[PDB]
Design a binder for this molecule. Structure first.
Ligand SMILES: [Zn+2]
Ligand SMILES: [Zn+2]
Ligand SMILES: [Zn+2]
Ligand SMILES: [Zn+2]
Ligand SMILES: [Zn+2]
Ligand SMILES: [Zn+2]
Ligand SMILES: [Zn+2]
Ligand SMILES: [Zn+2]
Ligand SMILES: [Zn+2]
Ligand SMILES: [Zn+2]
Ligand SMILES: [Zn+2]
Ligand SMILES: [Zn+2]
Ligand SMILES: [Zn+2]
Ligand SMILES: [Zn+2]
Ligand SMILES: [Zn+2]
Ligand SMILES: [Zn+2]
Ligand SMILES: [Zn+2]
Ligand SMILES: [Zn+2]
Ligand SMILES: [Zn+2]
Ligand SMILES: [Zn+2]
Ligand SMILES: [Zn+2]
Ligand SMILES: [Zn+2]
Ligand SMILES: [Zn+2]
Ligand SMILES: [Zn+2]
Lengths: 118, 118, 118, 118, 118, 117, 118, 118, 118, 119, 118, 118
């Protein structure tokens, strides 16, 4: 499952673009990301030092949601997810890996642009 | 709260001993360890690369449960818990930090001695 | 007073949140941030490689205004302030440590959002 | 040649400002940045893992356009250009070094503010 | 076939478990481990600094037997095999990679538990 | 395509031999090597700036390195990363295999058999 | 003295075995191992972060008791003695270096098997 | 008590001056430094690779006497005490940590200026 | 002006002697060192972890006054100025870079020999 | 131990390799305990490889065990070109693997030992 | 004259080519490379761990003769001359920095192609 | 001879003391230190970045004279001699290794105390 898609991305000259193209081909999103059993009364910001999911999110272990960490390859950012917790809207939690790649954290409020920001 | 206890152990010449005496004087165990949301159908092994809590255990982020990582000091063992998951017998889950300090992982079964092993 | 506050924040699972709660409870801001003797005719940008205060700011050595450097713990940002100089509005210079935690540098003009930006 | 200007900025306490003042005085832009032969135009993003030049952009080797790398001095930002490819609008491709110092990559779309963004 | 299996385990969240599941599904053991040509007059201990095979064991190059080295990923133990020699009972020498993942070295006598120990 | 072949060699005990047998079995050469836009250079094989002469193409070094492309350790560190490799245009369809197959002349710095002496 | 024995073992392809064979041949044990004052009746555990000698043991400096540290060669284990304190039964303290090579620490109670354990 | 003082010094902008002020306020010296047992008196040099206490001194493990190692914070000077032994005049051995901070080793004879030197 | 002098010294086989010869030929001292705004109630010691200028000294940022840091080359002492503060007698504060190369800190009182010492 | 004396002698010499050469010149016994590989012996025959490559006229040895610097625990002057790889040595010279690699050259073209397999 | 020429090559995109061109225009070779006083009973090989000049060569300290070390810039090759001795034919000892750039060491005999080889 | 002395000192718990007793018992000083070819019109200072021998000294490559570097063991002091040049009075140049162990460089004038100082 994941090994097939991850192997495909790991050796592509652009891993993120390969995952994107893969998904656009109807590919199955990477699974096995780890979720936190949290309060859901957090700030709701995107990437935090402790789980911060609010009622509309899930909190995942950062490294388990990072394409480069999962492909065991060098990062192009080292890694701003590893060791942190990533808050993902529940309606998008079916693809934690793809969500951080496709979205942007607001430099001002710390929340995902389009899902919490302003 | 945790800062007082952590501060007290962090500067002690033997942090694990300082935490032990603190608990022996009736101190509240360290909190805010990070608990994982898992299916409880794992191997039940003590320290693993993915959450492995069985029916009688809770899975926690390793660094969250390490006295040394929580105290921000050097390790004595780098760290055997960081980046991994620690399964704690549920009835001892009120003190994950203290549990790993007091118990031994069986070299054969990989389970905690006295808790799930042999 | 500084050691008491820094100790409390250093061991909290979320140091920035601890200082913020601490200030909201009326705690005194961290002092002993080192100020620069400079022209005060500089660009006025927020974080620079040489002092750049304009007439409405004070310049401080970066590491001295960084909660993580002051606390001697790892950074959640490595460190964007160490080795640099931070310009802080003079009306907010009584809490350089909290000021940079609460505010945002504009990625376009390099000045603090709300204090100089645009 | 490039050595005269590079030497002048290398030892300045603010290398970027020195290059700025140099150009403001009519100095000739640093040359010999390397160009990538992008044959099937790319995403147009400012800084990427593989050449991505639009119809209206040129792709340069990241390190060749970096003032810090070209001056062989520590960066202030490691280096966010090294190992990557920088796409510069063809009309400003005569000063790749100065271009990245003067402009901002949009955090949302990844294109240069004022050149490609939105 | 070796690259297919290694690739499968390399990207699995638990590589050891992935290899176990593959062997249980009747998968063929990883080959190309390196063997020592020695006089089998050794102590017979499990992991040693020089080849130590007795008559009923084969000595292998440790790294060639390590799933993590063969997969080129980080180790979870670092590597206790790399640079050393692993003695495997002749009747289990058809799967050196899986053998060390499934068995235990006795802390007392240094021989494999269940094969030689006590 | 590239991912399939690179995965195959990345896990082999001898990555270079694996790419050799793949090519020999008719496999397609690894593509996506980064080509440099350049001029009239020395034509030397591995340089610090692009140096293709008229019978060559200049490629970004790591792009053409099997080990860098496979993200595994080198056996050579890497003599291509950060440099530029000039490859005879007649062979520029397999830059990864070319450097694996050929030798740089220690004396003139050009490829043995392609420019040397 | 100690230099002759140490050089002999330092260059052996198996230093531990060389020291063992040297001792079996009548050789004098390595001396000059450093001892420290235990400031309470210690736990009596074998290897600790501070001196833990029981009334039947003596506490030695770990590195001093390490054949590999003493021989200035890379370890095989990195070093699990260095920086710690090693407790040796008083009547066996004429050979601290050999004692730790010969004995096993119980992973359960942390005392030497045969001298304290269970 | 030790944790209280070390915590106060650890977070002060000048750890050494904080300790000096704490002592001048009548505070009690830091305890638990580790004392060496010598069978013979040594050279009496201040900082040595093996214990060297003469008749007027006591030898201590260097790190245990280092304010920075004890506070677990970065050194100012890496650390000239760690891994070596410090000889402290007996009349001042009630405060080994404060002693090395207040005194100077003679560059010529290697003993403490004012105690032993010349 | 500073770039030209620093350039000249940085490539010399003996950088300090080059600056010295440059000054003796009447060259202008290197400028742009950073100065601290402090109370001037300090200890007056030469090199300190926080500014310690007394009434007749200026406190400068360490790396700013280091010839090797300014030339971006290795140190022949690591650097004893970087990250610290250097107190320079007021009457010699026109040449901070040269001052520290020509003078000596008293190992005893910590002040500059000939200026403050004894 | 068998090789400790000769290794100690070379380890502290200003030129370890020259010290071993002189030692051999004076009739010294070559360094032993190099580890031999059990392999096909139908390999490429090249000198230093990532996997055993002995042909029928060679023996493959573990690199580090054949390296004077690794055996002497001192820094290298060539990290190390043998460590982690395998050395193929002509069967007729296999009595001195540590010395064979110091005295011979690998052809940069064919990868085989100059004088033993090259061109 | 050295600082001017080293400055020019240090910031050039191809340092060795800039030096070659500088010499071809009549530039004076770099001086101040250090020479060894030996008996000249050496093997005459090009780059050795000890001085090995024969009667027709000078032995230079390797780093003094290395363009990159002298220019304080990263190496292209780390550095094969640093810490070693370079034997240069006496007739070319007037340009030791240019000599090693222009010549080749014979892989077989270890001497310079064209000066000693064969 | 050289290897005999160096091996003895290398494994001694105190190398410099071992060499000192060896000399005291009639031992022949370590030879093969490398001598620099110089003008002998230098400053005569003790340890310099370039050869600085005056007419009464010899200049030697630093590492060649350092007991720790010659023994291949960790230093106590990385190394202050490595990379530099040591000036030794010609009358003592028969034992450069021991001379630097026995003597002291004046912190003020930089010459050896007793041989050049004041
Ligand atoms: Zn990651
Ligand atoms: Zn926002
Ligand atoms: Zn930890
Ligand atoms: Zn068990
Ligand atoms: Zn910081
Ligand atoms: Zn703005
Ligand atoms: Zn850069
Ligand atoms: Zn945009
Ligand atoms: Zn491994
Ligand atoms: Zn057993
Ligand atoms: Zn590569
Ligand atoms: Zn050629
Ligand atoms: Zn050790
Ligand atoms: Zn026990
Ligand atoms: Zn310390
Ligand atoms: Zn004295
Ligand atoms: Zn400096
Ligand atoms: Zn003084
Ligand atoms: Zn080696
Ligand atoms: Zn050949
Ligand atoms: Zn160099
Ligand atoms: Zn030749
Ligand atoms: Zn040294
Ligand atoms: Zn003097």
């Amino acid at each position: 499952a994941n090994s097939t898609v991850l192997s495909f991305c790991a050796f592509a000259v652009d891993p993120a673009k390969a995952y994107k193209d893969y998904l656009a081909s109807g590919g199955q999103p990477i699974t096995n990301c780890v979720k936190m059993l949290c309060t859901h009364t957090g700030t709701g910001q995107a990437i935090t030092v402790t789980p911060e999911a609010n009622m509309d999110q899930e909190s995942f272990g950062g490294a388990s949601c990072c394409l480069y960490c999962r492909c065991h390859i060098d990062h192009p950012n080292f890694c701003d997810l590893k060791g942190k917790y990533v808050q993902i809207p529940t309606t998008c939690a079916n693809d934690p890996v793809g969500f951080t790649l496709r979205n942007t954290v607001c430099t001002v409020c710390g929340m995902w642009k389009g899902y919490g920001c302003s």
